[PDB]
GROMACS .gro file of C-alpha atoms in nm:
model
  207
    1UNK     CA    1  -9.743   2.856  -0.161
    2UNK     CA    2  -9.452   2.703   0.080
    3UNK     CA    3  -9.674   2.718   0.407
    4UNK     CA    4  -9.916   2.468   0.273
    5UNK     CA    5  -9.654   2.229   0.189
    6UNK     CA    6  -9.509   2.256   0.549
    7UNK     CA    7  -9.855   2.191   0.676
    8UNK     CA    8  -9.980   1.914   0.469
    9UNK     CA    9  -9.998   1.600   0.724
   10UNK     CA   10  -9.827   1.322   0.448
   11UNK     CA   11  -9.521   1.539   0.384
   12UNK     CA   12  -9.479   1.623   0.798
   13UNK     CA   13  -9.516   1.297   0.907
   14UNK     CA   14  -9.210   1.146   0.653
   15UNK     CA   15  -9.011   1.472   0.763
   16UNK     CA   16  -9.020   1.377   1.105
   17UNK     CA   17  -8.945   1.032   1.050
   18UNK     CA   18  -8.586   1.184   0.931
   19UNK     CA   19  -8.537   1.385   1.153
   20UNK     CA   20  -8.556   1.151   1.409
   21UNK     CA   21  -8.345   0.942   1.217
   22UNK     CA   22  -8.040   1.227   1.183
   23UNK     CA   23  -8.113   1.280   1.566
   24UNK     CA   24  -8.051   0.899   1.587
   25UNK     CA   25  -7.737   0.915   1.404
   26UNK     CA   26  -7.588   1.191   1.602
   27UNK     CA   27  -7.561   0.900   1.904
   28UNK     CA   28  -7.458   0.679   1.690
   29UNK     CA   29  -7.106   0.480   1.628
   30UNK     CA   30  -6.811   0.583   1.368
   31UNK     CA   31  -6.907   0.347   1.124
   32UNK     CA   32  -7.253   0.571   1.090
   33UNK     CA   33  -7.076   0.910   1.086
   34UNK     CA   34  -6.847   0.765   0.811
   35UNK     CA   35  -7.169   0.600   0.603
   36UNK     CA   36  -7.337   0.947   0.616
   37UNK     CA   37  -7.009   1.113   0.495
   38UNK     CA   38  -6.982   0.844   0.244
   39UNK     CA   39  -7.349   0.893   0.114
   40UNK     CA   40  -7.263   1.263   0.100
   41UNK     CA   41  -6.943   1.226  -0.142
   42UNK     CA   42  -7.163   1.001  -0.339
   43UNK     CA   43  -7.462   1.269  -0.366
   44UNK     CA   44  -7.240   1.540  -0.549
   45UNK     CA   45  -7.338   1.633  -0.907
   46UNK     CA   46  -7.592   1.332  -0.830
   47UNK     CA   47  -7.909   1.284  -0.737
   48UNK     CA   48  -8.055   1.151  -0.420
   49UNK     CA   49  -8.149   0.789  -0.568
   50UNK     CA   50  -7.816   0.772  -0.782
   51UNK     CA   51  -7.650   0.816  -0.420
   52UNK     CA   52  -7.830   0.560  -0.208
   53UNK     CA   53  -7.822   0.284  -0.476
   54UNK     CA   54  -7.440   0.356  -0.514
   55UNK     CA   55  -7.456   0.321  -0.094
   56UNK     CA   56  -7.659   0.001  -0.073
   57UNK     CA   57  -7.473  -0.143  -0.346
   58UNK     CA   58  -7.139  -0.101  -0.187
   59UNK     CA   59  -7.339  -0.179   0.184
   60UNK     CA   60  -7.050  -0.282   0.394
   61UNK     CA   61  -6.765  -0.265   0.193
   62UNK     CA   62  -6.726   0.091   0.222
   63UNK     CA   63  -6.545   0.038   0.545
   64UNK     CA   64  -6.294  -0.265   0.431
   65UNK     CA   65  -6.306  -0.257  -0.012
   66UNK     CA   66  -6.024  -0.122  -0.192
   67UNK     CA   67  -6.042   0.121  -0.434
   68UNK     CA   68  -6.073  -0.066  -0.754
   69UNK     CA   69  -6.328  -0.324  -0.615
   70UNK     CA   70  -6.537  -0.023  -0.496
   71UNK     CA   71  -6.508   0.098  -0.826
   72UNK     CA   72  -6.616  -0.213  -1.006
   73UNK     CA   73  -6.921  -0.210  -0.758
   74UNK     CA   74  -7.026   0.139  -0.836
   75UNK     CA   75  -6.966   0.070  -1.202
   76UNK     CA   76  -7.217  -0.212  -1.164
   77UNK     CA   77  -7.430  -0.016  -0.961
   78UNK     CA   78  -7.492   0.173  -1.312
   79UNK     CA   79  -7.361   0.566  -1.040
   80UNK     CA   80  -7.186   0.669  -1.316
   81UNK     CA   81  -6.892   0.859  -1.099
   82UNK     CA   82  -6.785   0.561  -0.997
   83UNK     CA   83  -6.395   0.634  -1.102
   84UNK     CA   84  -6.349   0.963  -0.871
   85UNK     CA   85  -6.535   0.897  -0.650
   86UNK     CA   86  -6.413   0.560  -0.536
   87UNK     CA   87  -6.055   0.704  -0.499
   88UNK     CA   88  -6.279   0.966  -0.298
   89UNK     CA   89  -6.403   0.687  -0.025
   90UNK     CA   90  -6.106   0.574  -0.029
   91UNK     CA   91  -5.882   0.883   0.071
   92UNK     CA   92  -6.184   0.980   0.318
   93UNK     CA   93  -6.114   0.658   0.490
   94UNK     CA   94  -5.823   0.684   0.505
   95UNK     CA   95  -5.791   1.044   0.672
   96UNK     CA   96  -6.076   1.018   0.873
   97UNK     CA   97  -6.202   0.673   0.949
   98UNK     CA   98  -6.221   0.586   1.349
   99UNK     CA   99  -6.188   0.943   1.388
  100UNK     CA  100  -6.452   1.121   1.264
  101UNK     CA  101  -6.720   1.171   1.496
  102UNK     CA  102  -6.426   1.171   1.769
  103UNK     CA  103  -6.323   1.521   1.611
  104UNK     CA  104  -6.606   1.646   1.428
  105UNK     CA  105  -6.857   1.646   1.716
  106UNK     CA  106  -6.716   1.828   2.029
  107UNK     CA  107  -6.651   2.076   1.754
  108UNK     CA  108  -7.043   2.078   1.615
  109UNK     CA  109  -7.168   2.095   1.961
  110UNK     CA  110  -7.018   2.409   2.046
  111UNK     CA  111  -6.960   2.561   1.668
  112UNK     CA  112  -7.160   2.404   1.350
  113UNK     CA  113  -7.034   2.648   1.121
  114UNK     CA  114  -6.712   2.623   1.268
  115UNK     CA  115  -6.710   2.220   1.248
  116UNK     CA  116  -6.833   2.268   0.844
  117UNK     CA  117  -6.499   2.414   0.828
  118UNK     CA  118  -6.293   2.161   0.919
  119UNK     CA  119  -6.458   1.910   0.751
  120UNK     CA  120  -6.365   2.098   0.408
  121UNK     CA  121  -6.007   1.932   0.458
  122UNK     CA  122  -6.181   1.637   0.296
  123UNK     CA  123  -6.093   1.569  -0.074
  124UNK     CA  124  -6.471   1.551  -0.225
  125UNK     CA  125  -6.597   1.766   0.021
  126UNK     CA  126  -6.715   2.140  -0.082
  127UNK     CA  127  -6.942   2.398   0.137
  128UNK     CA  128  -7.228   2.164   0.007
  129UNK     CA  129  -7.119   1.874   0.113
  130UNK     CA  130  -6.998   1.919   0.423
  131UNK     CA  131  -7.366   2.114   0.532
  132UNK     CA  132  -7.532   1.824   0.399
  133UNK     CA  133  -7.346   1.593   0.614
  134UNK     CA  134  -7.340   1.732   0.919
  135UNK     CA  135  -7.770   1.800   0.890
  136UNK     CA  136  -7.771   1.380   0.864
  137UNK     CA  137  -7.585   1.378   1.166
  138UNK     CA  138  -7.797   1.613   1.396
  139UNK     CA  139  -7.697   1.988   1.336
  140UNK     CA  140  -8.011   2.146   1.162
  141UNK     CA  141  -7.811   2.496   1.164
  142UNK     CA  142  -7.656   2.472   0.825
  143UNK     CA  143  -7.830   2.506   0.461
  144UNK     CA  144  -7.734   2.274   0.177
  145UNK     CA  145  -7.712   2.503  -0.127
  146UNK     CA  146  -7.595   2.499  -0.473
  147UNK     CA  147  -7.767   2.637  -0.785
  148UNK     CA  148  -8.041   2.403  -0.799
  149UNK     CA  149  -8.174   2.554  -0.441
  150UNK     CA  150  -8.066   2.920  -0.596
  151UNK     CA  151  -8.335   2.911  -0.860
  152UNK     CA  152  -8.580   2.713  -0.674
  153UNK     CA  153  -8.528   3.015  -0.384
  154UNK     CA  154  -8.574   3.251  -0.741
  155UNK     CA  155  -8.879   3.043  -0.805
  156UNK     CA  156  -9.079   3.081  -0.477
  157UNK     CA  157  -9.013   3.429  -0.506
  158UNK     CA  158  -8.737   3.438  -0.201
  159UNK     CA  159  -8.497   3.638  -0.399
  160UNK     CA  160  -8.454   3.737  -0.758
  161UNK     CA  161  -8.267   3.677  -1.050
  162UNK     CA  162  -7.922   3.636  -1.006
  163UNK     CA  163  -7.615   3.523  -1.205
  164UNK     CA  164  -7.425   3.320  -0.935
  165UNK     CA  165  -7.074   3.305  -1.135
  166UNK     CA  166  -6.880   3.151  -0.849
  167UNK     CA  167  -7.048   2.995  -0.537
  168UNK     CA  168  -6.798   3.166  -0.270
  169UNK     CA  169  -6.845   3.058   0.114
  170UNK     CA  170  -7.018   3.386   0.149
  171UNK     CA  171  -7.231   3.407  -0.075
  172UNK     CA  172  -7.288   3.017   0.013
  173UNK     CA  173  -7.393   3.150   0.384
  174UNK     CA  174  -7.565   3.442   0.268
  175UNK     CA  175  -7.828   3.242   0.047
  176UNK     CA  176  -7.839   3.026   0.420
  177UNK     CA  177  -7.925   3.310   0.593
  178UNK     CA  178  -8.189   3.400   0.388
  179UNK     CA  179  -8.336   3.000   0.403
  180UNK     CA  180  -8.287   3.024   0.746
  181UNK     CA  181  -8.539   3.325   0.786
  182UNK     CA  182  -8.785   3.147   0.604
  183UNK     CA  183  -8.741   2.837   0.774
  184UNK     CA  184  -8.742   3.013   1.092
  185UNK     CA  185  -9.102   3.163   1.029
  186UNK     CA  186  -9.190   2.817   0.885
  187UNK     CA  187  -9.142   2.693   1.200
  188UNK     CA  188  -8.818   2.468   1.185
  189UNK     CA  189  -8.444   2.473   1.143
  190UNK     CA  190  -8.285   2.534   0.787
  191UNK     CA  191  -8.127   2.171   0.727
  192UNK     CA  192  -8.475   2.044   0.789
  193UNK     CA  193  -8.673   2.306   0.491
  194UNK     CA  194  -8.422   2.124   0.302
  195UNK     CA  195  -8.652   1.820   0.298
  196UNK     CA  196  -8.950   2.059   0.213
  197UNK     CA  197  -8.803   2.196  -0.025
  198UNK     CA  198  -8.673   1.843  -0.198
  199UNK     CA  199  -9.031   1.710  -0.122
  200UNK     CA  200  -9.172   1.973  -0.349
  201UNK     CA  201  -8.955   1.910  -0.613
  202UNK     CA  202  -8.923   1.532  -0.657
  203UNK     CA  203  -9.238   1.426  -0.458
  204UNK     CA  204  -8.970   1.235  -0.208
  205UNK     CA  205  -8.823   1.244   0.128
  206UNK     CA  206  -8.496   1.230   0.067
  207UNK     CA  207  -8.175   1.242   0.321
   0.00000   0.00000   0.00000
């Protein structure tokens, strides 16, 4: 039911092409590292294509805009956070622009669930967040959960029914562990199933 998907040829192929793009992006300059986190303060309570369209639209002005002008562009962009989460950008930029990979990777290299904690010092960035942005960046170790991936996990039979009434950091790396097992027989890391599991839901490779 899962193992076909992470066989069929069309859906490898894409998966691959991302990963080699996160790989990529793990050599790559500050202004990447801060475009990833920026796509990943964008993606919260959104979906994937909300996100990029807000990104594209903004394109280079994330690194220079203020924050009303990058709210008028989000606003235009039809992303409808545009209000909190241009003052997000903004305050990210401000406490971690030209410094970002600088800290963040020694830290991943030796410790990824270590460097997900600092990054929660970010305003805008949660458990989820910070897991999803670090996986764009090259560290595969770390699941990006919240209770969309519960149920689907409930779905595929992976666990059961469950009334998730607060999403601790725990319980947040105990619903990883259990990804990671199946990813692990799968054949792969847990931030790539992500992009299975997305795949099988939208029909898209998403990021």
């Amino acid at each position: 039911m899962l193992r076909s998907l992470v066989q069929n040829p069309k859906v490898r192929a894409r998966v691959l092409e991302r990963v080699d793009e996160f790989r990529l992006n793990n050599l790559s300059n500050e202004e990447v590292w801060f475009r990833e986190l920026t796509l990943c303060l964008l993606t919260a309570n959104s979906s994937f294509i909300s996100a990029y369209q807000a990104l594209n639209c903004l394109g280079q002005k994330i690194y220079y805009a203020n924050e009303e002008e990058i709210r008028n562009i989000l606003k235009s962009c039809k992303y409808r956070f545009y209000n909190l989460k241009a003052k997000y950008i903004i305050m990210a930029r401000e406490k971690v622009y030209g410094r970002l990979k600088e800290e963040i990777k020694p830290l991943a290299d030796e410790d990824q669930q270590l460097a997900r904690e600092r990054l929660l010092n970010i305003k805008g960035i949660g458990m989820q967040e910070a897991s999803h942005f670090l996986r764009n960046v090259g560290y595969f170790d770390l699941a990006i959960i919240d209770r969309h991936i519960i149920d689907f996990m409930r779905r595929i039979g992976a666990i059961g029914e469950t009334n998730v009434k607060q999403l601790s950091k725990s319980l947040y790396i105990s619903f990883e562990n259990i990804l990671k097992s199946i990813a692990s027989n799968l054949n792969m890391s847990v931030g790539i199933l992500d992009l299975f599991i997305w795949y099988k839901e939208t029909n898209t490779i998403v990021k």
